[PDB]
């Protein structure tokens, strides 16, 4: 009949803080003892994180758990709204499962978009994704991140295999944890761009790193179904789909394509189109958030 006063969706596709470490190209195989890059200060005064002078390659590394059961909220206030939401996500996956969203997540893990600023000036990027079964490597991938585009979604055998593995983890048929390690050729003594704190760069234990929410924002840029002119490309799935650095807000609620109007039409009165906005609202609840009255 109505929406609950409190509604909480927990995070799926759980990332970690991407630890960064310098190294040389063609040494990506035995890249375990690689020294982590640290933040220095210079001339009011600012922070800067470069590489060591004998290293032409950055390597970031983070572990991504995927959870599954994304349509089950962690908090509600009425049982009827949770039953209706579970029925809508259940008939979503019974019409078509996680085949488009898992393919786009495998794309955003294939092209190293979690390299936020380090990707745009990189000569060659290689992403290695290891599916850690018990404590060892079960299936290992080796993706050309620059050959796979940022705004076009290709078709490939290995990428559809990664899409099927992320789909199996997202449906709940298996536990999926992926060690994702990206080698980016940037140059000798070039500058890396970790996440900046409240200019102070973020670090954990004498090691510059990217935040977990920045990596979670980067692999979430899959939204291509919105009334923009063609040329923007994929944006991240936020409700009232915003780019606060650009100062614009696509799917503003005067147009009826935001997350909340599509949710309260797709659940409370059974109204959404065939493929596009259902994928948008399901990816938005895959992200998680706080909704309600």
């Amino acid at each position: 009949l109505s929406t609950a006063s409190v509604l909480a969706f927990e995070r799926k596709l759980d990332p970690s803080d991407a630890l960064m470490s310098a190294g040389a190209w063609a040494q990506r195989d035995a890249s375990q003892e690689w020294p982590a890059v640290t933040v220095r200060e210079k001339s009011q005064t600012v922070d800067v994180a470069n590489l060591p002078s004998d290293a032409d390659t950055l390597k970031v590394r983070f572990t991504l758990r995927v959870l599954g059961g994304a349509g089950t909220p962690s908090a509600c206030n009425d049982a009827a709204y949770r039953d209706k939401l579970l029925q809508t996500v259940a008939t979503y996956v019974n019409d078509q499962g996680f085949a488009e969203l898992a393919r786009r997540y495998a794309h955003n893990l294939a092209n190293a978009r979690f390299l936020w600023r380090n990707r745009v000036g990189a000569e060659a990027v290689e992403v290695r994704i290891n599916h850690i079964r018990q404590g060892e490597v079960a299936r290992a991938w080796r993706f050309d991140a620059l050959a796979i585009g940022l705004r076009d979604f290709k078709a490939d055998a290995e990428l559809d295999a990664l899409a099927e593995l992320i789909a199996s983890g997202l449906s709940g048929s298996g536990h999926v944890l992926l060690e994702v390690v990206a080698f980016a050729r940037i140059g000798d003594g070039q500058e890396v761009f970790p996440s900046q704190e409240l200019k102070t760069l973020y670090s954990v234990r004498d090691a510059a790193a990217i935040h977990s929410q920045k990596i979670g924002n980067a692999l979430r840029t899959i939204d291509t179904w919105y009334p923009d002119e063609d040329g923007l490309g994929p944006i991240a799935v936020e409700p009232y789909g915003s780019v606060t650095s650009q100062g614009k807000a696509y799917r503003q609620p005067k147009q009826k394509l935001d997350f909340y109007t599509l949710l309260d039409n797709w659940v409370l009165r059974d109204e959404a189109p065939a493929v596009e906005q259902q994928h948008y609202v399901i990816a938005n609840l895959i992200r998680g958030g706080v909704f309600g009255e």
Partner: peptide
């Protein structure tokens, strides 16, 4: 240069 949700123009034109 297409739009992109990372748009430092000084830095895009820099690279």
């Amino acid at each position: 240069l297409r739009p992109d949700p990372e748009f430092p123009p000084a830095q895009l034109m820099s690279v």
